[PDB]
Structure formats: structure tokens, C-alpha cells
Design a protein around this ligand. Structure first.
Ligand SMILES: Nc1ncnc2c1ncn2[C@H]1C[C@H](O)[C@@H](COP(=O)(O)NP(=O)(O)OP(=O)(O)O)O1
Ligand SMILES: Nc1ncnc2c1ncn2[C@H]1C[C@H](O)[C@@H](COP(=O)(O)NP(=O)(O)OP(=O)(O)O)O1
Ligand SMILES: Nc1ncnc2c1ncn2[C@H]1C[C@H](O)[C@@H](COP(=O)(O)NP(=O)(O)OP(=O)(O)O)O1
Ligand SMILES: Nc1ncnc2c1ncn2[C@H]1C[C@H](O)[C@@H](COP(=O)(O)NP(=O)(O)OP(=O)(O)O)O1
Ligand SMILES: [Fe+3]
Ligand SMILES: [Fe+3]
Ligand SMILES: [Fe+3]
Ligand SMILES: [Fe+3]
Ligand SMILES: [Mg+2]
Ligand SMILES: [Mg+2]
Ligand SMILES: [Mg+2]
Ligand SMILES: [Mg+2]
Ligand SMILES: [Mg+2]
Ligand SMILES: [Mg+2]
Ligand SMILES: [Mg+2]
Ligand SMILES: [Mg+2]
Ligand SMILES: [Mg+2]
Ligand SMILES: [Mg+2]
Ligand SMILES: [Mg+2]
Ligand SMILES: [Mg+2]
Lengths: 477, 477, 477, 477
């Protein structure tokens, strides 16, 4: 029941409150030691072997630091230690709902296995937090340190997910955990207004440390010049006008990361292969949940006791199996182990403001196969031999400019906020803020099938009006 | 079949020969992605989640770099590209035989489970290298690049392990892979004379990067001033006389690491608990090997096909099990998951150089139990409630001075080596080079049992003529 | 006469040829130990106290590394050790002509003191190299190591400066040092087609290390994928087509640095004050040159012996002086020592494609003073109380896109180069590549004077059809 | 009059109180921008170009951080903001008395130029602090922020230097700035009991950053486990018992630095040459002080107004001079500029516990010359051709063990301290804690002179009962 100290390779030595220590030392939280932060990227970057455990620790520490600084430099906000504990707990448990290989589970697998439900890992995080609190007798411990569980659990849940109860924007306050007087406390762990939060800072630093790519953003300088100001009967976190350029750079940094590591094409195809292996391995793996009931890999998100035992272990559970009824997924994983991967064909961009919707992906391989090239190639390829991948690259707000939703204050008048437009900053800033990319892969790896795949790709690219391949003079001359 | 580039957060961008790529892309080598470098230390240092895969990559790269530099600066040594390839292959496969949690498997488990055999992970590395070469059709590929497999496989094996075939030192050359005039090539990956090799450099850098501690050794400076000289009809690697102090510091660094991370009290007790869980879980886990035969965790080192599937996965295989025959090991692992660990009692050193030998460990708990305090508490304790751990801290040569087996050359006469004694360097250097420590833990966490545990500890420590317990006045007033 | 090793905090240990050591150990080169790399920026960033000596060392080392790698990977280019020595010498002596406080000497002082000559520090570098070679007896030493002085001195000079003796582009080869089949050797130290050279890499790394701003560019990866290909009967350095995005990022990095450190407001005004102090201190400082002749600060660029003694020392020579004729410059420097600096008024951007040319700067303060604001204040400010600074921010080629002059090759056909347009890369790239900024400062430092100065500034900005003052509703409401 | 932020490459962004800003913006403090931290070491390590300005900033910041942490974690000590300001000011102004090239001014020059006075740079720091406070009207500003100048100036002075007023240890409190119940505040900036203070931490970090050698000490961990406890009716700073080994390592680190950078042979001989040049240049340089009086380089420490203008500038003042009376020192500096340095002959250690005292250095070269070697030597060397340098390497307390004066506390009883002996820690620790080294250099640089010099060196070493030369079988066979 004393302050603990833990050493971090990203931050320094970190202090942990006894209640935080109690929360951490449970099976539900310890589950995070066995889930990769970057999923399949570890198969392209050999140094990316870190897990969500240290990421959660860092996010909690940074949330605590930011709230402490805000309270210290401006003591009329009425920030109490109860609020500090609540914010730290919310930051600590914000990723309890990630599945095997993180985003691959909720970005690729669940959509294809159970296409009738809508599910995100934040909902899973809320459910897992409820399960953790109920199964470990934590409410008395919270009451022992001055928390009020009925209000505070709701406050933490609303910190992890949106306002909840669905919105009705007729000039109303949607939240319930805290009054509007402290609305800024909802902008720390996850910022729904412009996307500036400590989670980005933490994973920027940690991913740059582990990948071998050097980071360019400085969050301590941002914390130095941060303030709280009243805007439109709404207290929000504001930066200083002289930091505006830095903010732009931050988003640039994020984009760069997505373009170098998270959307690497070999890593993406490896993730696709793992998803296909899981799809084939389904209907045969059993997980025991509450009441001795059995669950599927796809239905395990309906029971937290069963979901607690679903980690990256399942991967090695399929590779080492001997059951003759799991042979196909085992063959796929073995092919992964030999680097016999699906081969990349080409890439393209839409020209105009036309975009591919989510519910139109399944037909793309059919249209690539259905094309009729002019040149006559010997081999014929079916629509089952093609994989089409769509990538959405934006600044986090669907072609909106995030910096237009930030408030700024001047040195001479620190208690009044303003807005800055893009033309008041620089002429060298980007013009657009969202785009799509399309990659095409072929499953048949014959040196002959690749030529046919390229011919169909170029014909489909030409007739769809989707620009032309970069190397239109090298691979298709 | 072209040079391949890979990015490492320790060494940067690294080039790989196509034969190396063929060797890497096999199940036997890909096994190393699922075994941690530090084992249980990951449960004390949250950033130590790296595996043997990147360590092997780095060791191979550094071996190649050192041999290239030596060849470049001395063109009369007759170093060929065949030798470079062989040395790189040997460095790449040096830790190919580690088991689950690395040194825990061959340091704690095998000795207790099968105490009639003598086994090290280098023998396993040799066996696994043979299995890898035979199971993947590599000999033709080696022949394609100018290697002679019958000589070169023996050379690589002799690089990984000692001279082999038992020694008879009557003025003879024990090795077979290479003649006498290439002997220095046996000092790169593993140095049996004084212990200076690239493996130490690599894990120093990597462990310090991941743990959050900065190292003070520079190996590039050492490579700059390295040379090859003839000593007693033996060609060996020599450093320059001005680097002697640096060499001492290097060993100091190693000791410091062992005293901070590798021999941490909580990490060691966690490793002990995991070993106990594996001991109880044995006789119930089955692994399929060649011919459809079944193997135990302890007997899996007798078949390489079965050994290929034995990784850290087994840990999570026991925790998630439902078989009633595995309840005890599962209970122990669950205890670990709650931080309900065995409690540390005390520590001591032998003063009179009466080093406790290996075959006296099992009786130590009896001696701690079988000891009558003067004061009476009436709580009692069986000998089954005590854990005694013996730690050997040395400079790698069992109380010998390693720097006495190093050769040095001067600037004016670069082609003649000399020796330097400890009194020609400094008076502030260590006077001994080996020591022992003894730690005691109790398996009952009652606030009452802890007091009796330390009463027996102090009585037995006083009895055995050892030192008095440090800071004893506080815990034993 | 043996290879020398030197330790660098940016790179590692660096090897130096005996001829390089002879060149370094001369007064002309040792002069660089007393000129700062960033000039007045040291008065805003306390860690920027490095000089040009280490920068020159690093540039030479990197030039050698790049040429060595290019020769190693393509034996048909016929790169000899003579070329390596010549390139290293050119990289080592590329900044011999910098004056006190580096860019402010040839960017601010010489233009204002002697506005009838056109002078850059590269011409000074060539003259100083000639002086160094002639006054130290280096030609026989060059002949001792296989160099041919008559051709090689011209080659080095043409490496430091352009083709020389003016061009006539009627399909001719302008250079003389080397034939047309080694033209790529002219693209290493200073690149004229685009701005990709080792000098940028070196000062990026060093300035990021010293300022406390972290770097984002990786030049080793660039060296890994570099190649030489024939383009339009020109042998040129081409990059790998998958690195195009990285190249864009590089220029972004450069811009960021200019926006954060090199064009800081307070640093620029401090440089302006130092330039004014030097202007007033002239007519009174005497420097002895060849033949016992005396020279001025402004006329010292006409004699290299006199120029050798002109370093940052002159600064402290004025501050510690006692002559009554140097009193005004001493007062200005003393005011600098108290942070009684000229106060910043405002900033603005041109709206359209109109730009302020060089020969219109002197009249700008008159225009600002001559403006008639609407509201009336008692205080009247003359044109002598205003300072106007014009900043040009571009990608190094005056609103042209540098990436349009880069050549790329594909993996399948490594011996044929291609071009990539901006629309084949991304839609998030900048639209324009150059812009101007205008800052205004006032010399009178009382509050009424500042209010009046900003009234004139806003009136003039409105009059001349420029953008809004960012704080158009805060400081001017 | 607002908190000011400054960016540091060693620490992060640092906050500065307005009073600190007023103190910094004065000529006396700004003088530190032109004195180098390592003196002549910059001529061996090209990256060591930093000055005392940033070192003072860092020391002040770290003192503030430590006092803040101590006050925060233990609020019964009654630490006020007045104490924080006083401690920060003391840390900020602790090196105001350093002269040109720092330690060589008060370590080599003053002893030889004025052998009748005893002078250290801390006395100069106290005098310069008095001059700064009196010449800039700071007392009213201190009164404006709650300080009491009469007590507080004395407190700061006693922080920079010892107790003052000469000691009489008959159970009395020697200090006067603060009462006996705040005594721990005297252990922060400069620790006279055991030598553990923030100044060591700062220059460890900064010198490691600039030299290119990685640091091994972590001071943040030390601050985490620091506490204040009553020892013998004396409140003192105590560490945690588990950190004892770390403390040893810290001192090891210090020794290593002294053995690598600060006592480098070439750096020391360069410092000796600069000292000789200053000795010859004296009697001819005039500095103006108070009342229009003129002072010498050696007598400038008697007037603070004259001392304010004495920096490294004097170096370049002699090199660029034209007066015929300064010709010898100019020749010496010019010889330095060519690397025509005094040549190193040999090194030796005393065998027994006999040590060379300070007042026997002048006769050492006479003893070396007066030796009569047996072998026949061609040339004869006078005693003016020899230089003998004596180096004392200790742990900072004249062969005493510093760790014997540290107090420790246990987790169970955090309010009562203990002592730990060297045998309770490890058997691998050093046996002795101080030693002496003697280097010999020759001024005549021809080969015959070097051979003769080493013949005399070996004969004298044999005579004086010293350890034989390391390479006694290489250079003198
Ligand atoms: N010398 C060292 N240097 C850096 N980090 C270290 C370290 N030693 C440990 N760590 C890391 C390891 C951990 O991540 C963290 C805590 O290590 P402990 O201070 O050993 N904490 P514990 O609970 O064992 O001692 P107690 O309960 O008696 O107070 O710092
Ligand atoms: N911008 C970047 N910056 C740093 N590292 C990067 C990187 N991009 C990838 N890496 C890492 C990832 C890897 O660890 C390593 C090589 O990845 P690649 O060469 O980019 N991809 P592949 O081998 O398929 O190119 P090829 O067409 O020639 O086959 O560098
Ligand atoms: N332990 C060390 N660690 C890192 N850098 C060091 C160093 N010692 C010196 N340096 C730095 C200092 C220099 O920048 C560079 C050379 O130092 P020297 O090896 O001492 N070269 P010298 O000419 O004195 O010895 P010789 O002529 O007998 O071969 O490395
Ligand atoms: N983007 C940046 N990133 C890192 N450091 C920076 C920086 N910009 C400046 N620094 C460094 C430079 C300095 O060492 C320090 C302060 O820079 P200012 O924030 O510019 N302070 P000032 O007084 O000019 O603005 P005001 O008075 O309006 O508040 O941080
Ligand atoms: Fe997150
Ligand atoms: Fe190893
Ligand atoms: Fe340059
Ligand atoms: Fe200091
Ligand atoms: Mg603990
Ligand atoms: Mg999340
Ligand atoms: Mg988010
Ligand atoms: Mg590839
Ligand atoms: Mg091994
Ligand atoms: Mg070994
Ligand atoms: Mg040397
Ligand atoms: Mg230049
Ligand atoms: Mg340029
Ligand atoms: Mg300011
Ligand atoms: Mg001092
Ligand atoms: Mg001291």
C-alpha cells in the first residue's frame, strides 16, 4: 500500500499509486503482456516486439503528468486528487479491448467473420473494464482512497468512449460523470474534437524507439505552453499562438509513420494471410467461458471470461497442432514461415473526389478479373486469385483540417482564445487532407502468372480511370 | 538471390548474403522469434521483450564486420570470402539451441528434471544446426557459392563449440576445419582463451538499449586498434597497449549488468517459480517428434523435430488449460499472475573461500531448517518451506584474471606482442575476481512465518561462520 | 605519416590520411576553430557553441564514405584512390572562406559596407585554399602520394565552386579537372542540379545534436540505395524509386530547421545589431596584411594574409576596447549584453505572386514611416526608428521543385533511369515551393513608441495590400 | 517579470524565475560565454567546445529540482520558496570565478606566477558575486520577491564556499546563514562531507554528451530514493540501502573520465605550453580596472572590474599581436598551431606509500637531468630540456573512502539511518583509493634527443625506486 517505482526505456522512473498497482495485478490487465502493439509489422521490422502493457503504462503516466501540470499552473480550475486518480485510471485501461495482433483483429477479421455486428476495441475495453472491476473486488479499494464508485466508474467509461446514450445536440451537456465546469478533463486520454491527446505522444515515442526511425515531435514543449480557456461557454485546452506551426508538423509526423511502417505492403499482406488462416481455423477452436460454455474465435467477444484467454498464443496454437481438421490454416502459416507470400502486383490512386465505399470491396477482385486486356496472354486467372487492398490516409478527421478546431491564446491576453487560418501560417502547407490508395496482389506465384496479373491490373487501371501506374514504362512497357 | 537489406534499431541497415537469407527462412531459425532473451526478467523490467532472433542477426553482422576489417588492414593473412561466409554463418547460428526462457531452461530446469545427463545449449545448437542443414536441402546451395560442405560444416561446428573429440595437449592442433595459420578465426564468435568476442558486444548494446541503462563500452574503437600477431607459433588477435584500461572497464560493465538485471531477486524467484511449475506440469504434456513418437518436456532434447516446437508458448499452454491433471502448475502460474510471490528473507557471503559446490544445494534448506534459534516463537517451519539460491559472480574465468591472457603490441613495433601485469596499469583495480552469494526465500507469506524465517536465517548464518546479515540491526534488532 | 584516428560526437572514430593531416595542421585551417557555425543563434540556443572545424571534418568524412561505397558497388566506374583523395580534400576545405559569425558576414555586412562588389564565401574559400597550398609547401607532398597538382587543384576548385569562367551551353563540357565520363564526382560535395549532398546531411545531424531538436532524415539508408546511371549522355547519381517520398521528407526537414532556429526573430535582430556595431566600428580597426599593409574589416577580403586574422575575436576586441573613437559600437554591444534589444512589431506575407527584390530594401522603412494611420497619436516616429527584414523561404531552387530534377531506377531494370511527377507520389504534398516574410522592428522601446509603431505597421500593411496581421483582433483590436 | 523558458540539449525545457533572469542578464554572468569548460581538451576532442554558461544553468536547474523533490515528499522539513530561490541562486553562481581555460588558470598558472598567495576559483566566485550584486542594483529586486538580503547573501556565500570565519570544532555550529535545523541545505550545491552533489551530475552528463563517451550514472533514480534523516543531532541527506552499489559505480565513472579525457597526455602538454606562453606574455599585457588603474594577468585577481575582462580572448590577443615585445609567446602559440608539441618520454608510479609533495616539483627535472646512465649516450641534455608532470588520482577525499561517510536507511524503518562497510557490499571493490602518476616530456624534438631523454628517464626511474616502464622491453630493450 505504498508508492511503487517502475523503470521505463521511453520515460524514466515512474511512480504508481497503490490503487493503480491493485488494478494492474489482475489477469485481465496482465493479458496485455501477450499482444503485439504492431501486429504483423514485427515480421518486417525485427525490433518491433513490444506489447500493449508498456504502452498502457506510458499513457497513464502521461495523462497524470498533463493533469498535474494544468492544475499546478492555474489553481482556479479546482482540480482535485480524485480527478487525477480517475484520469490516470482511464489512461491506464484505455486499450483493454484489443485482440490478437491488435488492429488486425478489429480491422480485418471481425468485419469478415461476423459482418452483421458493428464492433470496435473501445467497446471491448469498456466491457473488459467492467469485468475487471467486478471480478476482483475493486470497489471497496476505490472507496478506501476517496473515490465515489457510482459517479467515477461512469466518468472513466465516458473518458474511454464517447458521451454515450447517443447524442441530441439541442444545446445540452451529454456527459454524466462530471459537470461542464470540468469539461476539459474529457480531452486528455482521447480527444474527440481535434485528436490531440497523450496516446499519440506515447506511441509516437515508443514506436520510433523500437522501429529505428527517429521522432520529430516534442510533447514536453507542448505541455509547457498549454492552458485552459473559456470558449463559447465551454472550457477547453488551448495552445499558444506561436506553436501553431509545430502542431502542423505533429500531424505530418503521424502521416509519415503510417506511410513507412503501419501501411508497409509486405506487412499488410502478412496480416491478410494471418486473417485468412484464422478464418479457416474458425469452427474448430474452442474457448471455455462462463458457465462452462464453449465459444468460437469470432463469438468470444460476447463473453469477457472467454475473451480473457484470446491472445497471440492462438497463432502458435494453430502452427503446432496435429489435428487433421486444422490442416489448411496450418499450411497457410507454414507458407508464411517460408516467406512464400502473395506477390504484389501494382498500386493506384483515384483521380477525382470519387471514393470507394466500405461495402463495395468484395466485388473489386471480380472487376479486376473481368477486365479484357488488349494483348493476349496465354494464362487465364480467376477472380479468386486476386486480392485488392484499400488504404485510407488522412489527418484523422475524414478530409477535414484538424488545426481549424484548435484554440490559441496570445501572450498579452492569456485569458481569451482565437482561431488561426491556414493562410496566416504558411503557403507551403498541404492543400488536401485525405486520400485513398489501392494495392493489388496475386496468389499464384508462378513467373508466368505474374505477367498476366500485371496485364489485367493495367487494363483495369486504365478503364476505371484510376490514374496510371507509376512505372508505366518499366514493368508494363 | 540478391543482397538483402534489413533495419535494426541497434546496428542500422544491415546487408545479408542470399545464402544467409536461405538459412534464415526455415522453421528451425524462425523458432527463435518466440523465445525471450532475458526470460523472466521481463516481469521486472517492462521493456525487456526482445527475442533471440535479432540478437543472432546482430552477432552475425558483427562477426562479419570484424573479419572484414581484419582482412582489410592486413592483406597477408590470406582471408578469403569463403572464410567470411563461414564466420558469418557460425555467428548467425550460435544460439540456435536455446530453450524456453533461455538460461532458465539449461540453468535450472534440465539439471533438476534429468540430473544424470550433462547438457548445454551449445550442444543443442550444434544438433539443431545439423537438423536445419539436413532438413532443408542447404548443401547444394552452399556448393553453389563456392563452399566445400564437408570441411565447412565441421569448421562452423568447431566455431560454435570447443575443439571437439576431447583434448590431448601434447603439442598438437586439435581443430580440423582450418589449418594452424588461420587459428585467429576461432577467436571471433566465441573466445575460449580470454572471453573477448562479438556476442558480448551485441548483447551489451541490445540489453542496455531495452532495459533503460546506458553502457560505457565502445567496440568500434576496439575494432579500430585490433591486429593479428604471432605469439608462440600461434597467430592470435592482439589489442594495442594503450587500450588495456578500456579492457578492464569492459569486464566491469559486464559485472554491473549481472548485478543489476540478470541476478535481480524478484526475477530470480519468478524464474524459480516457473521452473517449479514446469516440473509439476511434466509427465502430462506431449510433443510429437520424428516417427510419430511422443516426448516429454525433459526428454524433448533427444529429438530435434520435437525440440523445434518447444518455445515460450508452453507457458501459456499451461495457464489456459482445463485438464484436471494440470491443476497444480496452473495454480502456481496463477499465483505468479497476482504477484503472490515467495518472499525474500536474507543474503550472505562466504568469507573464507569455502565455495559451496554444485552437489550440495539440495541439502541447504535442511540446514536452514535444522538449526535451533536461541529465542522461541513456537511457529516452527519445515525444510520444504525454504528456497536457497547460490549465485556465482566472476569475470568469466573462475577467479582467474582474463586480462592476463590478452596480448598487446606497441606503436613502434606493431609485429611483436607483449604482456601487461595488473600493477603496471593502476592501483585502483580489483584484488579478487570471483565470489559467491547466498539468498534465502520463504514459501509462506504470513506476517508471522516471516519472522520465524529470519530467526532461522540469522541462526544458521551465524552457525555456518558466514558474514552477519547486512543491515541486520533493522530487520533483526 | 600514418593513418590518424579522431573521435567525433556525431559520427564515430574517423580515419585521416597523412596528406589530410598535413593540410589540417596549418594556420589557415586552424582559423576555423574560432568561427561559430550558427553565428548569433548561440544567444538564443545556449547549446549551439560549435564551430566550423568539426563541420568541415564531418563533410570530408562523409564525402569519402559516399565515394567509397559508390566505387565498391560498381567496379566498372573506374574510381581510383586519387579521386577519393581529391574528393575528400574538396569536402574538407569547402568552408575556408566563412567570415566572423558565418552567414551574417556575407549575408548582412558585406552587402551594406561595400555595395559595389559581388562576393560569396565560396570565392573566399577558393582564394583561401590557394593561399593555404602556396604558403605551406603542399604541392611536393601531394606529388608524393600520386596526385598531379596542376589537374587536381583545378578539379578541387571546380568541386568547391561552379564550372568557372562562365558557361556557354552550346552542347559543351564546361569543367576541366576531369573528363565527361566521371561527371558524377561533381555532385557529391556541392550539387548544382539539385540540393542533395553530404554537406546538408552533416549539418542536419550536427545542428540537431547541438540545438536539442531531434532529426528525422536517415542518410545511411540513402547511401544504401544509391547508384550511378547514364542520363542523356550524362553519368549521374540516381536513387531508388521507392525512396521518392523519403526525399520529399528530407526537404521538409530542412524547411523546418529554417523555420525554428536559423530564422528566429530574436536571433535575427541580434545579428542585425552586431552588423550595425561592426559598421560603426569600421574606419577604426586596422589589420596587418602582406607587405606590412593595413586593411579594414570591409577591405580585408582583398588579402588572404589579412583575412586569416579576422574571426569572432573582433567581437570581444570591440567590447573590451578603451579608445574614445570606438564608443558607439561599444555602447551597442553593451546594450546587447543587457538584452535591451530592438522590439519586434509585426509580421506579414505578400498576397499575390509579387515579390520584393533586393534593391528595394533600403526604402522600406521610409514607406512604413510615411504611412498615415487613421487614429491620431501625439508621438511622431521618423524613418530612422524602423527596421524591416525580408526572409526568403524556399526549397533551395527559387520556387522550382527540386524533386523534378532527380533520377530514379527500378529494381527490375537497375541500369535505366526514369522521372517521377508530384501526382504519382501523394496528394498531401505542398502546392508551392517558395514564399516571403516581412518582419518589422522598432528601436524606441517605450510603450507609447511601441503602440505608435504598431499603428504605423497596421496602416502600412493595409495600404500595401498584404495579408492580415495574425493578431488582427488581439494586439490591434 | 514572468517565468521564462529556455531550451537545453542536456536537460529539457527549463523554467527561470524573473530574479534569476535579472541576475543572468549582467556583464559579470555573461562573461562565462567566453570561457571553455574543458580548456585545452578541445584541442584533442574536437566536440568539446562548450562553455561554463550552460553548465551553470544546468547546475542551478538541478539544485532547484532536488530541493523541490525533497520538500514535496517530506513536508515536515518546513522548506519555503525563499530557500528554493536561495539554493537556485547559489547553484547558478557557483563558478563565477573561473579564469581563462578554467582549471589551468588556478591549477597551473597562478601557482607559478604568484607563488606567495593561496587562491582558488571559489574565492573568486564569492568576490565576483559580491561585485555583481553591488554593481547592478539587485538588493531591491531581492527584497521585492521576499528575500532578506543580509541573511540571504551570507547564506549563498556559505553555500558556495566553506563555513568561513575559520573553524573551531568544539561542538559548535559554524554556519550563520541558516539555523542548525536546515543543515541539509548546505549539502546540495557543494557537499563537503562526502562529495555527492548536483554539480557532478551536471558535468558528467554534459561532458559525456559533448566528448562522445556514454554516461553510466542515473541521477534521477538517486533523487527518487533520497530522504532526510537525523544523524547524531544533525539532519542529513540519506540514500536507500539498496543503492549502495550504484554509489560505488558513480565514483568509478568519475575516475574513468579523469583517466580518459581530463588527464590526456597531449591535452596536458598543450595546457603546459599555453601556461608557458602566458608566463612569457605577462609584464606586457595591460588591463584597465577601477579608478583607471592598470593590471597584469597575474594581478587581475585583485580587482573584479579588471577580472571581468579576462577570458579566453587573451589567447587570440597574443597570437594576432604585432608588438616585438610579445614575440616569444607568439612563437610558442604558433608552434602549438603546427602540432610541434613537446614529446612524451615515459610514465611511472611510486612503489610504496611515499608521495611527492607540492614543494618538490621544481627540482624534479634537475634530478632527471642529473642521472648518470650506464650506456654511452651521444648527446648531453640540460635540465631545462625536461618537463615533469605529477598527477593525483583519487576518489575526492585524499585516499579516504567516501562511501564510509554516507548514511543509509531501510524500507521498514525509513526514519533511522545506518552505515555500510566495504565488506558488506562486494569483494570486487577497489582496495586503495588514491595514487600518483609521473609523466616526463622532452622539448628537443630530434631523434637523438629523444633517445637520450629516454636513457636518462630509465636511469632515473631505476634510481628512484619506482615501477619499471610498462614497455621496458620494447622502447628500451
Ligand atoms: N540499478 C538499477 N538501475 C536501473 N533500474 C533498476 C535498477 N535496479 C532495478 N531497476 C529497475 C527495475 C524495476 O523496473 C524498477 C524497480 O526496481 P527495484 O528498485 O529493485 N524495486 P523493488 O520492489 O525490487 O525494491 P523494494 O521493494 O525493496 O523497494 O527499476
Ligand atoms: N522509410 C523507411 N525508413 C527506415 N526503414 C524502413 C523504411 N522503410 C522500410 N524500412 C525497413 C523495413 C525493413 O526492415 C528494411 C527493408 O525494408 P524495405 O526495403 O523498405 N522493403 P523491401 O525489402 O520489400 O524492398 P524491395 O522492393 O527491394 O524488396 O528497412
Ligand atoms: N578511451 C577513449 N575513449 C574514447 N575516445 C578517446 C579515448 N581516448 C582518447 N580518445 C579520443 C581522443 C581523440 O579525439 C581521439 C584519438 O585519441 P588517442 O587514441 O589518444 N590518439 P593519440 O595520438 O593520442 O595516441 P597514439 O599517437 O599513441 O596512437 O580519440
Ligand atoms: N520549435 C522550437 N522547438 C524547440 N525549441 C525551440 C523552438 N523554438 C524556440 N526554441 C528554443 C529557443 C529557446 O532556447 C527557447 C525559448 O524559445 P521561444 O519559445 O521562442 N521564447 P521567446 O521569448 O522568443 O517567445 P515569447 O517571449 O513570445 O514567449 O526554446
Ligand atoms: Fe493507445
Ligand atoms: Fe549469444
Ligand atoms: Fe558546409
Ligand atoms: Fe561546476
Ligand atoms: Mg517492491
Ligand atoms: Mg485505443
Ligand atoms: Mg484516437
Ligand atoms: Mg524485398
Ligand atoms: Mg550462446
Ligand atoms: Mg561465451
Ligand atoms: Mg597520435
Ligand atoms: Mg559552404
Ligand atoms: Mg549548398
Ligand atoms: Mg521571451
Ligand atoms: Mg566550481
Ligand atoms: Mg566539488
Amino acid at each position: 500500500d505504498t508508492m511503487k517505482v517502475i523503470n521505463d526505456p521511453i520515460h524514466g522512473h515512474i511512480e504508481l499509486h497503490p490503487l493503480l498497482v491493485r488494478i494492474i495485478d489482475t489477469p485481465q490487465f496482465q493479458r496485455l503482456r501477450y499482444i503485439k502493439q504492431l501486429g504483423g509489422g514485427y515480421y518486417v521490422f525485427p525490433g518491433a516486439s513490444h506489447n500493449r502493457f508498456e504502452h498502457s503504462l506510458g499513457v497513464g503516466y502521461l495523462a497524470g503528468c498533463l493533469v498535474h501540470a494544468l492544475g499546478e499552473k492555474q489553481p482556479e480550475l479546482q482540480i482535485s486528487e480524485r480527478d487525477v486518480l480517475c484520469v490516470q485510471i482511464a489512461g491506464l485501461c484505455h486499450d483493454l479491448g484489443h485482440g490478437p495482433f491488435s488492429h488486425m483483429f478489429d480491422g480485418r477479421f471481425i468485419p469478415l467473420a461476423r459482418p452483421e455486428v458493428k464492433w470496435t476495441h473501445e467497446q471491448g475495453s469498456v466491457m473488459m473494464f467492467e469485468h475487471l472491476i467486478n471480478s476482483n473486488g475493486i470497489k471497496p479499494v476505490m472507496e478506501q482512497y476517496g473515490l465515489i464508485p457510482e459517479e467515477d466508474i461512469c466518468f472513466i467509461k465516458e473518458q474511454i468512449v464517447g458521451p454515450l446514450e447517443s447524442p441530441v445536440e439541442d444545446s445540452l451537456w451529454p456527459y454524466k460523470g462530471r459537470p461542464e465546469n470540468k469539461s476539459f478533463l474529457y480531452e486528455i486520454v482521447s480527444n474527440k474534437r481535434n485528436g490531440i491527446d497523450v496516446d499519440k505522444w506515447d506511441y509516437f515515442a515508443r514506436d520510433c524507439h523500437h522501429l529505428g526511425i527517429q521522432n520529430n515531435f516534442d510533447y514536453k514543449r507542448f505541455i509547457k505552453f498549454a492552458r485552459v480557456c473559456e470558449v463559447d461557454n465551454e472550457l477547453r485546452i488551448c495552445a499558444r499562438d506561436k506553436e501553431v506551426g509545430n502542431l502542423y508538423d505533429m500531424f505530418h509526423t503521424r502521416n509519415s509513420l503510417h506511410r513507412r511502417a503501419y501501411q508497409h505492403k509486405v506487412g499488410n499482406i502478412i496480416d491478410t494471410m494471418i486473417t485468412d488462416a484464422f478464418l479457416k481455423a474458425d469452427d474448430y477452436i474452442e474457448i471455455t467461458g462462463a458457465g462452462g460454455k464453449k465459444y468460437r474465435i469470432s463469438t468470444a467477444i460476447d463473453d469477457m471470461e472467454a475473451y480473457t484467454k484470446l491472445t497471440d498464443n492462438i497463432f502458435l496454437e494453430i502452427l503446432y497442432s496435429t489435428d487433421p481438421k486444422l490442416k489448411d490454416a496450418r499450411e497457410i502459416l507454414k507458407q508464411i514461415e517460408y516467406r512464400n507470400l502473395f506477390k504484389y502486383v501494382g498500386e493506384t490512386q483515384p483521380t477525382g473526389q470519387i471514393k470507394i465505399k466500405r461495402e463495395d470491396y468484395e466485388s473489386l477482385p471480380k472487376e479486376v478479373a473481368s477486365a479484357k486486356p488488349k494483348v493476349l496472354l496465354d494464362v487465364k486467372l480467376k477472380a479468386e486469385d486476386f486480392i485488392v487492398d484499400v488504404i485510407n490516409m488522412d489527418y484523422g478527421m475524414q478530409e477535414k483540417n484538424p488545426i481549424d478546431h484548435v484554440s490559441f491564446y496570445c501572450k498579452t491576453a492569456p485569458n481569451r482564445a482565437i482561431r488561426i487560418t491556414k493562410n496566416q501560417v504558411s503557403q507551403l502547407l498541404p492543400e488536401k487532407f485525405a486520400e485513398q490508395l489501392i494495392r493489388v496482389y496475386c496468389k499464384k506465384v508462378d513467373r508466368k502468372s505474374l505477367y498476366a496479373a500485371r496485364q489485367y491490373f493495367v487494363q483495369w487501371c486504365a478503364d476505371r480511370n484510376f490514374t496510371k501506374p507509376q512505372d508505366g514504362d518499366v514493368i508494363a512497357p
